[PDB]
Amino acid sequence: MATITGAQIVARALKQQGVEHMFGIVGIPVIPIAAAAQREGIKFYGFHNEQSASYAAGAVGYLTGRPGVCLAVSGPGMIHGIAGLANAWSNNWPMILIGGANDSYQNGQGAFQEAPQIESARPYVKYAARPDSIARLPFYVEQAVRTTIYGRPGAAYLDLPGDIISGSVEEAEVTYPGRCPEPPRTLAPEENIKAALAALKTAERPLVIVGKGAAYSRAEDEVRKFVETTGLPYLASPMGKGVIPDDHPQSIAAARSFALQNTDLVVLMGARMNWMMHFGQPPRWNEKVRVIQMDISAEEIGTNVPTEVALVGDAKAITAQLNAELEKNPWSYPSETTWWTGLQSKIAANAATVEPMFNDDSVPMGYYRVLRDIRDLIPKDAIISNEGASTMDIGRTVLPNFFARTRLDAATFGTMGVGAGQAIAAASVHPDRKIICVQGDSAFGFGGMEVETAARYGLNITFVIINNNGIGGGPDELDPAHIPPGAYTPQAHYEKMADVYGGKGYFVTTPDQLKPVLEEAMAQPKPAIVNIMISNKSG
Amino acid sequence: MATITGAQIVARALKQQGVEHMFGIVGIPVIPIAAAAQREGIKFYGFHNEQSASYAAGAVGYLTGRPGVCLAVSGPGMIHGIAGLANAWSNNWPMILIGGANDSYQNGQGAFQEAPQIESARPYVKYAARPDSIARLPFYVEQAVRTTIYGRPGAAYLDLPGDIISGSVEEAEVTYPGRCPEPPRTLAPEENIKAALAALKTAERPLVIVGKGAAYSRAEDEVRKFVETTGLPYLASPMGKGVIPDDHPQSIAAARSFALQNTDLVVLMGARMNWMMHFGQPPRWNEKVRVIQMDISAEEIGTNVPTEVALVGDAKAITAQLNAELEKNPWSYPSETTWWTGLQSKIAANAATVEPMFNDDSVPMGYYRVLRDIRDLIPKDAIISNEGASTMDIGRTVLPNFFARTRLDAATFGTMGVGAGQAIAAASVHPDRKIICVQGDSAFGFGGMEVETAARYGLNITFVIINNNGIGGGPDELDPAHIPPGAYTPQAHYEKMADVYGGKGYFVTTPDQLKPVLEEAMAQPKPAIVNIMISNKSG
Amino acid sequence: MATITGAQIVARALKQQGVEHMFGIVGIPVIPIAAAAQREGIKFYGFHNEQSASYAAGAVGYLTGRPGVCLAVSGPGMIHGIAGLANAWSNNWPMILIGGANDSYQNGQGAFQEAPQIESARPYVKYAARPDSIARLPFYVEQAVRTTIYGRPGAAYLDLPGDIISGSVEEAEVTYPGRCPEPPRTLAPEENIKAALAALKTAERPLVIVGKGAAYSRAEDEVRKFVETTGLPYLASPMGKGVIPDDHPQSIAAARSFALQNTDLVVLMGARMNWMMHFGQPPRWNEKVRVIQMDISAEEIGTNVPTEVALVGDAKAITAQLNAELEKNPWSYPSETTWWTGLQSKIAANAATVEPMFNDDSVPMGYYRVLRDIRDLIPKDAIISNEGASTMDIGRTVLPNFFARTRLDAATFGTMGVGAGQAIAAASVHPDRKIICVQGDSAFGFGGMEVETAARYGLNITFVIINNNGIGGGPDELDPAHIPPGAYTPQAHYEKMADVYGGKGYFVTTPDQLKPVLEEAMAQPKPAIVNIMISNKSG
Ligand SMILES: Nc1ncnc2c1ncn2[C@@H]1O[C@H](COP(=O)(O)OP(=O)(O)O)[C@@H](O)[C@H]1O
Ligand SMILES: Nc1ncnc2c1ncn2[C@@H]1O[C@H](COP(=O)(O)OP(=O)(O)O)[C@@H](O)[C@H]1O
Ligand SMILES: Nc1ncnc2c1ncn2[C@@H]1O[C@H](COP(=O)(O)OP(=O)(O)O)[C@@H](O)[C@H]1O
Ligand SMILES: Cc1ncc(C[n+]2csc(CCOP(=O)(O)OP(=O)(O)O)c2C)c(N)n1
Ligand SMILES: Cc1ncc(C[n+]2csc(CCOP(=O)(O)OP(=O)(O)O)c2C)c(N)n1
Ligand SMILES: Cc1ncc(C[n+]2csc(CCOP(=O)(O)OP(=O)(O)O)c2C)c(N)n1
Ligand SMILES: [Cl-]
Ligand SMILES: [Cl-]
Ligand SMILES: [Cl-]
Ligand SMILES: [Cl-]
Ligand SMILES: [Mg+2]
Ligand SMILES: [Mg+2]
Ligand SMILES: [Mg+2]
């Protein structure tokens, strides 16, 4: 009778549960898993460090609604992968770390790479399991996948001893669960839907905030209809950008600080009152601000600031409830108020502030001058990976998104080291699209070796480094006796790393080079690296 | 009156406790800690990834007997550094990870990089503390330091909320403990000393195993005297190499398998019966092997295999006891026995096997041909960082050490990613010496960016890459449809990364290039990278 | 061929490793373990609550130097037993908690009493393991036992899934390790021994502190010799009482506060500078006290106060080193010093203060009057379980111990709930001796049901209750509208609980009852309960 190994069972089960992308580094005892994954049609990418690979797995979860898988060897391989668990935990992204473990009959002997891996994953996962036996592996795979995507999404860890992977059972002894179905999109009570709309009608300065929860829910159509029907001003969080196109006339992103400080009623659509929103507290918010909060996690309701109307459930379903109730009882915010006037004035004052910076041609160059030529060459449906400090914060302001889930950045954990991994994930999920990775020089160095990974798999990524010689800048000449802790080699020629795989690297210092270099670099058949020097005083 | 910040208190206490080397990446909230560490005379190295920096910290502990410090930001910074905690835990090396945390008065709010950092470090540390107040910081620093180096050495984690770092107290409020003394060197009972020597006199095929615990104990003088007085055959573990010079006539390294399989009594001097020694069990050991075990950890005694004589205490002190008892009652193993004859015959047969490989000039080249020329140009007091699979395992055989603590490799955890970090740690500890980094191509990619860190600090490191196109080898041409999980870009020109910082990169394919290229590379004032292609069949 | 279950294997291995006492409560799946333990000759005691049972296991470890075993069912049974693990952790006593677990093939299903038991035990154990297979069970038992008694003693947890317990293997597949030997008694370097005695000679006001680590080391004969040879004053910690007989002329126990405040050099013999010693800090100690510290734990050296001479190793062996060096170089503290004269003055005042209270016959009675008659009737070799607040702290003062390891109290963790369990442990280890349990009324209530356990097994235990109607005293009359949080029913007749098992209960309120009742109760063939009312203003 026919037999099958644990590795093959895991690969077949993962494929059945909708897993399509796997990132990691092979080695004892997970070599057969990557091989069986390739034969099952799962796309496997061999990275240079599991850290970057584990970040890629979480980004796949955000982009597709099914967990990406990070495959790691026992011990230090799994521990490197904890970075991606924690990032997925922080952003509530579906993600599975699969870590090898030493053979179970060697526990307690000081086996090769013996480590407490379950306990190391526990703080950051919704689910951690070591399968008891080979025949029950599909049980744990299905339960892990379902746990990552049902409820508030998050991370799972599977601990596979080497003898579970390499052992075999009779195929007739293995039961496979059906593919985990899409999670149920739960709805708010009818009274909360009505109380939320009634509350909006009493507000003098209302504001909608569209966060990456709305983007993960795939709610862009419902959100856009809700914002347009109500005529409400809206603000997109960094990764909420593009749920509504960033050029929409009701966006007040250029008046963000004014809007947050003066709004009296905010509608949080899949966004938390966490550090990114200044906890919804003074001085950045008004002391008496009223909150309508839409979130799949009931425990998030009322964090930091009380919530007047709680809308617990799926953002797509709940926003459809609001649009349906607005169909029965139409209402819109007026086009001319003192609120719109003040918002429109601040937007105009901001345009006056940034225009001299956008057209500043002095050398060394500023952020705005460089991001202007980058922005004007990105395809409209390209996916942008944007990572750094000022590179990423100004990048958020200058680089628009016109579709949902097309910006990947440092997100809630503020992580450096996600840039190349998230770009590789985006390229894997969207093979037909252009991927633009825009990183600060420090951010680039966290996962720089993965440019070769992008070349090896033929990924349509272009790497742009905005280089000010360090973390928020570094001197033009290093004094060997006093190297600042956050400085790097002045004018480090990172673009030379393209020569590792036969790609093209460009070194840019003057504004006249920007457009012809960025154009020729984006048309390259291999990933190009564009290294753009900027002033260490720019900001 | 005069005041002082938490960051300055921590830097001063660390310096008082004998900390000399700090590796990490700055950012909120640890920016002032690196600044104050430099003002106290602590050498701070800004890395490209905290993963590599945390590995450097553990290597410093091994090399110096005082913990190296890894400095990481809150959240993902600290989580990246968990790699170093686990490596230090695996090797019992003294090491401190200092992790920033969010301001304490923002706990529970979703603060920037809020994370359960103590619980993340817990599985791998002997000590984890969040200092309760600024004034007590020196209490925690001394307790952390003392705990890493007393008893079985291990890792510590210090959790520093931003307001503990940035807040101030009056200088007269702070008490600084004295410098933590050297740990007391404990002795074995005198009857155990006599029983051990008595047991040795009954053995027909005795063997000494010199492990890195003897190296860490700084026991080289007593261990060499003990082996020479007794005339016993000895086997050095990978990082035990050099405790006795590797050209010593009593080394049976080239007959290792024969020695372990047939010995009837082994003396473990700071070495574990773990996976490296195949658990001391059949078939690689004899079923009835008798064990004299010398370890500072009483709990380690009798793991896997029963121990006949337990010598619990410090290796230097216990070996001095053995030498003093041999001085009162002399004894030595006879220089002509059938045991010696078999060992000598196996060593000679091994020399006949490897001589053709050492002199094989065929292209693409093999490991032995390449390592032969590396070996002959390495200074005798150089420090070797050797990392990979066959690159490291063959490197252990071919590259000799003549002094203790001059080899750093993947060690007990089998970690890829330590190579450059441990090389940088070695250069920091021994600035007067040449550091040779010999890695496989895959190993090099785990932290290849750190070659720029080596250049930025002017470290005397030469990076040698032994490149077979992947993990255990990769094909000469990649099939875009079928990319092997462990392959990299064929003939990837990693030496081009030397151009990032203005160094010299060399690409070697034939034996005639080896000697002049390695000679010119080692004499470079900046770190050179030598990329050496070998066959993917070799190993 | 002959087969054997996992339960029978575990019972056989525990017996081979020196385990002689098992306490717990049976149920799925540990029922076969208790039965097999009885057939092996292990004494099994069925308690009424795993909490009390787990406290008995730790006490067995302290008394015998081999771990007592607590046997608990899966889930809440094991969780109840964590109390004992934490107490053993706090006191560094060897103990094993053996917890059942649900069948491994039901993991993830919501099985009966499925719970994360290893992670629940982790913070308090030196060792936690789920055996991977039935045939390797003896490996884990020996490793667990060895880990509890080697090094600094502590607790271990064995997680046993029901299918490991109930399954069977062929006896020829099971290898049993040899009995774990007594750990080696490690020595301090000879220069530290000389340094300690040399520092002793420079002291103006030297003091010896004898802790329960010296008692656990079985070092009483060496400690008594050292103290008598040097003529030094000594203080016995609560459970260090009896190491030297409490009526020894050199005891300064009655001048404890004066001695700690004025000593300029203390010899700590198995005793910590923890909360019990007020951290060795002012105002209770002198700011400049010098410390000679003798402890098996290197990490304990130098906690809170610097240590001038560290003596790391076994108390018995190291004290014998001190006595041997005092034989080569005799020294003794002079008579007629102001130190001894000041101490004897303080001792005489204390004796004069308490003698009125010893003879005060007023009703309600006081602590000293009651404990005077208890003291005058306890056999010299009896074992005293003394628990509560004032009942225990004054009991420490009034009830002397003449042999080592004859006082069990709340110890380092200050735990209520240990009294009856530790009395049952003591009766199990020393069946030939009288056990006296002297508890406060609140302390008695924690484990009161276990008086039936003592009667069921014919244990020679007398239960004395000192009753002041609550935690540190409650009112004479309870108003139902305002019941104090720490008060109990006034004059609660706990002695009526002897009638549950057909024993004798006594209720005592006047001094003329004390002697007749106590004499009658101690001669009972079943455990008697003496409920002694005392004033709530006493103490
Ligand atoms: N399907 C869904 N429907 C509604 N809310 C969701 C859904 N999935 C996740 N969320 C919530 O969206 C929120 C996203 O918040 P956050 O990550 O802070 O967004 P941003 O960073 O864009 O402000 C999380 O609190 C999460 O619980
Ligand atoms: N000062 C010391 N004296 C004696 N033994 C020590 C000392 N420090 C550490 N050790 C022990 O040395 C052992 C080294 O074992 P291991 O790392 O397996 O060596 P190797 O890998 O070289 O065989 C550890 O068990 C550790 O407890
Ligand atoms: N065999 C031994 N020899 C010496 N010290 C020991 C031994 N076993 C345990 N100890 C130590 O004895 C100390 C007991 O301290 P503690 O419990 O505070 O005593 P006490 O409460 O009586 O003051 C612990 O620090 C422990 O490490
Ligand atoms: C894992 C991790 N380590 C460190 C940090 C701290 N940090 C925040 S931004 C940054 C780099 C900023 O420099 P760069 O990417 O060059 O951007 P710039 O601001 O100079 O444009 C670092 C190290 C972090 N957020 N995450
Ligand atoms: C953190 C970590 N990830 C993965 C592995 C698995 N592993 C062991 S050796 C190795 C690299 C082997 O390739 P290379 O360095 O080129 O050496 P070669 O054997 O080809 O000479 C890898 C990835 C590991 N040990 N540690
Ligand atoms: C597990 C636990 N719960 C609670 C306490 C708090 N506590 C300390 S002493 C004590 C009892 C005091 O009353 P009693 O035993 O009657 O003694 P008395 O002082 O009245 O003589 C209690 C509950 C504790 N130490 N441990
Ligand atoms: Cl979260
Ligand atoms: Cl040197
Ligand atoms: Cl403790
Ligand atoms: Cl005391
Ligand atoms: Mg920068
Ligand atoms: Mg290779
Ligand atoms: Mg009471």
Residue numbers in the entry:
A (entry chain B), B (entry chain A), C (entry chain C): 1 to 539
Please share text taken word for word from the publication where this structure appeared.
One such enzyme is 2-hydroxyacyl-CoA lyase/synthase (HACL/S), which catalyzes the reversible cleavage of 2-hydroxyacyl-CoA (2hcCoA) into formyl-CoA (fCoA) and an aldehyde or ketone. Originally identified in the mammalian α-oxidation pathway of 3-methyl-branched fatty acids, HACL/S has demonstrated remarkable catalytic reversibility, as it is capable of condensing fCoA with various substrates covering a wide range of aldehydes and ketones with different carbon chain lengths. All the enzymes are tetramers, specifically dimers of dimers (α2), where α2 dimer represents a catalytical unit. The three domains have specific functions: the N-terminal domain binds the pyrimidine of ThDP (PYR), the middle domain has a regulatory function (R) and binds ADP, and the C-terminal domain binds the pyrophosphoryl group (PP) of ThDP.
Structures of both TbHACL/S and ApbHACL/S with and without acyl-CoA indicate that there is no notable difference in main chains and side chains except for the well-ordered C-terminal regions. All structures contain well-defined bound ThDP and ADP. All our HACL/S structures contain bound ADP in the R domain, which assumes the Rossmann fold nucleotide binding unit. ApbHACL/S has stronger activity on C2 (acetaldehyde) compared to C1 (formaldehyde) and C3 (propionaldehyde) substrates, while TbHACL/S discriminates less harshly between substrate chain length.
